[PDB]
């Protein structure tokens, strides 16, 4: 008899949900000709489950920040993630041509940290539009973009007519309703930002009008190039807020991760989302995925897909195959198929776990 | 054979530490005449262990905020707490005679939340003085006090000569060094605060000069009485900060909980700290102590001490008796003395835990 920790994502019972990309997007098949499911690491037998929210070409972080949006939506006791690759160093995103992808990688890490920690304690994830009102005549402007990637959260608001510089203070009201909590971005250009001969230090506050909490960021970097848009990801309660800009462009959330239905602490499961080695990926979801709130799973091999080089891999197929059955015990070392006896002690465990005793 | 969850605090191995009050203060015996150890719930056999930091009459929260200070200091993989009672509704603390103890109870809850969560991930706790520099000629002032309790963290700084009201903006620099992280208070009077015919709305920011993060609180309450000094407990990194007051009195930290030596996640154990029923206690440490980071233990009886009514209780003695031996498994339901078989599945477990399987 053998009850080793196995390298899969699974579920204690039927109460689970997976968030993904093309490698688990059952709907993508209609855009394959001929129709072929092999682009998936997910077993298509799960295509009718109602337990997956995945979109080819997308990722939760991508959708959170950019116009290339998919309304990831799902609910489960145990939450599983297999996405992230669709925002990687490969995409070489930077707000401007003189920016830094490293900043965007740092953002990615901070985002998924909040997502993983919070989905250990809420059943439900979706996206909600965040309404805001700005009183001036200036409109939103797409100042952060690169290739086909256009940032739209937070929004930037253009300077008013009548101002000649960026030393102005302006504000907007944004309102959060419909969720227990909300993940929103608070961002600044962190660097010496040149505009018409003057160097700016971006400053942005958000203010909960009723709790009285001020959350702010001011630029502190001295470099005049190779800097970018640094974001923090706030986890906020419902209420009415001001976005108060003290320098450069006013920024205000336009989308939030909507967290609902508080649950008993239940660690999330996260599968490494990377390209075949020929493209540059990152380890930001690995950094984000820590005990006790997250179990991280990865294959021991290069990602070599059979449909194309980046889709349909033996190693990841195997990891996801655990979704085809119930398993009693989840641990840092893996998933145990039996709840009785083992030869290793499950670490940071959840479920009905075996003893490594005599 | 029986392996039930037992209602004790214990330790997997020798690597543990307890923080306490008189009920575990071995040094207090010298102030008993004749010398009598019965005032303790702790077994005096543990008096030579070097694993306890306790002080009669005190509590971590009491020491954090007030002049009645004890430099709680300790290091351990598993941290245990048996204190809190020395700041309870019984003490009826409020900053002023028109204040609210409920505010102070809320503060207490928020404080211990940060302490418990963080001692699940650091080995070492102590207190450090926080140096600050204020540039004006005004001095600190003891504006918050009641009975023998005098608040000294955060400090209040008096108004300068030359100001006739409290609509002024002033600041201080405070510096955090010597720890991986620091718990400090950020507080305001949350209410309409009357001074010489004018009503104030206290405003306080802290600013990390190098990370650029602004942490602020502004008063939002409309009540003109029955309000008090609301505190939030920030967990900050080392660095150089400004305390920027925008209204009422400038407040600045004078003490921090000093957190050191990052460790693998290890839930803390917390024992209910209450008076005999004849005095008013609170459940704030219970609220603070949640899975996965904390196990809460309580007796099923009134606290009836044998030394005096508030010291040396059978129920709490029993809970603490588990410190006299190693135990393999810690769980929400209790401590399991054996790591092999049981009849219940350990929840949120840590250590070598039994199976409830066949
Ligand atoms: C954050 O940045 C803002 C904007 O740069 C700072 O506010 C400005 O501070 C300078 C003083 O250095 C003044 O000249 C401006 O009038 C201020 N603008 C305002 C208030 O709109 C702000 O003080 C910084 N926040 C801190 C340091 O906590
Ligand atoms: C927090 O409170 C402060 C102090 O009351 C606010 O700053 C003052 O705002 C009023 C405008 O209502 C002005 O009359 C004062 O000149 C401001 N004082 C300063 C800047 O020292 C502050 O705006 C509030 N913070 C918010 C709303 O985020
Ligand atoms: C995402 O879908 C959810 C569930 O239908 C809906 O409430 C929410 O408004 C959607 N968010 C969008 C379209 O931004
Ligand atoms: C996943 O495993 C592969 C193959 O061992 C390795 O190259 C890669 O760095 C791992 N990814 C992370 C995020 O650890
Ligand atoms: C991620 O990569 C960095 C190197 O860039 C490394 O120092 C870090 O430990 C890695 N973390 C994980 C969790 O793989
Ligand atoms: C799907 O593509 C895979 C990999 O290219 C290949 O094995 C197979 O020919 C295709 N299957 C069908 C039914 O066309
Ligand atoms: C553990 O469970 C498996 C499957 O039921 C069984 O074959 C094995 O003998 C069991 N071992 C025990 C109870 O020691
Ligand atoms: C508490 O004791 C520790 C350890 O000796 C010391 O570093 C620290 O300064 C003390 N804190 C005080 C006296 O505030
Ligand atoms: C501890 O138990 C006693 C006796 O059952 C009960 O009265 C008390 O409320 C409990 N305290 C907390 C904080 O739950
Ligand atoms: C603490 O007491 C309040 C009533 O004041 C109650 O609503 C709350 O559930 C209690 N919490 C715990 C953890 O005992
Ligand atoms: C200590 O006090 C306890 C409780 O009052 C009592 O049983 C005993 O007389 C005392 N013990 C000694 C050695 O004096
Ligand atoms: C569990 O351990 C206890 C103490 O060693 C022993 O008496 C009992 O029989 C064991 N039961 C098992 C291994 O089933
Ligand atoms: K701004
Ligand atoms: K103040």
UniProtKB/Swiss-Prot annotation, chains A, B:
Residues 1-109 are annotated as: Esterase domain 1. Its EC number is 3.1.1.53. The active site is at 22 (nucleophile), 308 (charge relay system), 311 (charge relay system). Structural protein that makes short spikes at the surface of the virus. Contains receptor binding and receptor-destroying activities. Mediates de-O-acetylation of N-acetyl-4-O-acetylneuraminic acid, which is probably the receptor determinant recognized by the virus on the surface of erythrocytes and susceptible cells. This receptor-destroying activity is important for virus release as it probably helps preventing self-aggregation and ensures the efficient spread of the progeny virus from cell to cell. It is a single-pass type I membrane protein. Belongs to the influenza type C/coronaviruses hemagglutinin-esterase family. Glycans are attached at residues 36, 71, 135, 218, 283, 298, 340. Residues 110-248 are annotated as: Receptor binding. Residues 249-358 are annotated as: Esterase domain 2. It comes from Bovine coronavirus (strain Mebus). Homodimer; disulfide-linked. Forms a complex with the M protein in the pre-Golgi. Associates then with S-M complex to form a ternary complex S-M-HE. It comes from the Viruses. Residues 1-358 are virion surface. Keywords: Disulfide bond, Glycoprotein, Hemagglutinin, Host cell membrane, Host membrane, Hydrolase, Membrane, Signal, Transmembrane, Transmembrane helix, Viral envelope protein, Virion. It is found in: Virion membrane; Host cell membrane. Disulfide bonds join 26-47, 95-144, 179-258, 187-231, 289-294, 329-353. It is an enzyme of class 3 (hydrolase). It catalyses: N-acetyl-9-O-acetylneuraminate + H2O = N-acetylneuraminate + acetate + H(+); N-acetyl-4-O-acetylneuraminate + H2O = N-acetylneuraminate + acetate + H(+). The gene is HE. GO terms for cellular component: host cell plasma membrane; membrane; viral envelope; virion membrane. This is Hemagglutinin-esterase. GO terms for molecular function: host cell surface receptor binding; identical protein binding; protein homodimerization activity; sialate 4-O-acetylesterase activity; sialate 9-O-acetylesterase activity; sialate O-acetylesterase activity; signaling receptor binding. Changing residue 248 to A: Loss of receptor binding. N-glycosylated in the host RER.
């Amino acid at each position: 008899f053998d009850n080793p920790p196995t390298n899969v994502v699974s579920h204690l019972n039927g109460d689970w949900f997976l968030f993904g990309d093309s490698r688990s997007d059952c709907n993508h098949v209609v855009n394959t000709n001929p129709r072929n499911y092999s682009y998936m690491d997910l077993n298509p037998a799960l295509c009718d489950s109602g337990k997956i929210s995945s979109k080819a070409g997308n990722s939760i972080f991508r959708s959170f920040h950019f116009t290339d949006f998919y309304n990831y939506t799902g609910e489960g006791q145990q939450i599983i993630f297999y996405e992230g690759v669709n925002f990687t160093p490969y995409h070489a995103f930077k707000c401007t041509t003189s920016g830094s992808n490293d900043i965007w990688m740092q953002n990615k890490g901070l985002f998924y940290t909040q997502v993983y920690k919070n989905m250990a304690v809420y059943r439900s994830l979706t996206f909600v539009n965040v309404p805001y009102v700005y009183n001036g005549s200036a409109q939103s402007t797409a100042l952060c973009k690169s290739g086909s990637l256009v940032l739209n959260n937070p929004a930037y608001i253009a300077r008013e007519a009548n101002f000649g510089d960026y030393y102005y203070k302006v504000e907007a009201d944004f309102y959060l309703s419909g969720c227990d909590e909300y993940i929103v971005p608070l961002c600044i250009f962190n660097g010496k930002f040149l505009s018409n001969t003057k160097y700016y230090d971006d400053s942005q506050y958000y203010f909960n009008k009723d709790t009285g909490v001020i959350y702010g960021l001011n630029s502190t970097e001295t470099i005049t190039t190779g800097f970018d848009f640094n974001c923090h990801y706030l986890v906020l309660p419902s209420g009415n807020y001001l976005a108060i800009s003290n320098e450069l462009l006013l920024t205000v959330p336009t989308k939030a991760i909507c967290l609902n239905k508080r649950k008993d602490f239940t660690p999330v499961q996260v599968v490494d989302s990377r390209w075949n080695n020929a493209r540059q990926s990152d380890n930001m979801t690995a950094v984000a995925c820590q005990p006790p709130y997250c179990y991280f799973r990865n294959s021991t091999t290069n990602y070599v897909g059979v449909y194309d080089i980046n889709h349909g891999d033996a190693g990841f197929t195997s990891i996801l195959s655990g979704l085809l059955y119930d398993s009693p015990c989840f641990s840092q070392q893996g998933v145990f198929r039996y709840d009785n006896v083992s030869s290793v002690w499950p670490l940071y465990s959840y479920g009905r776990c075996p003893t490594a005793a005599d």
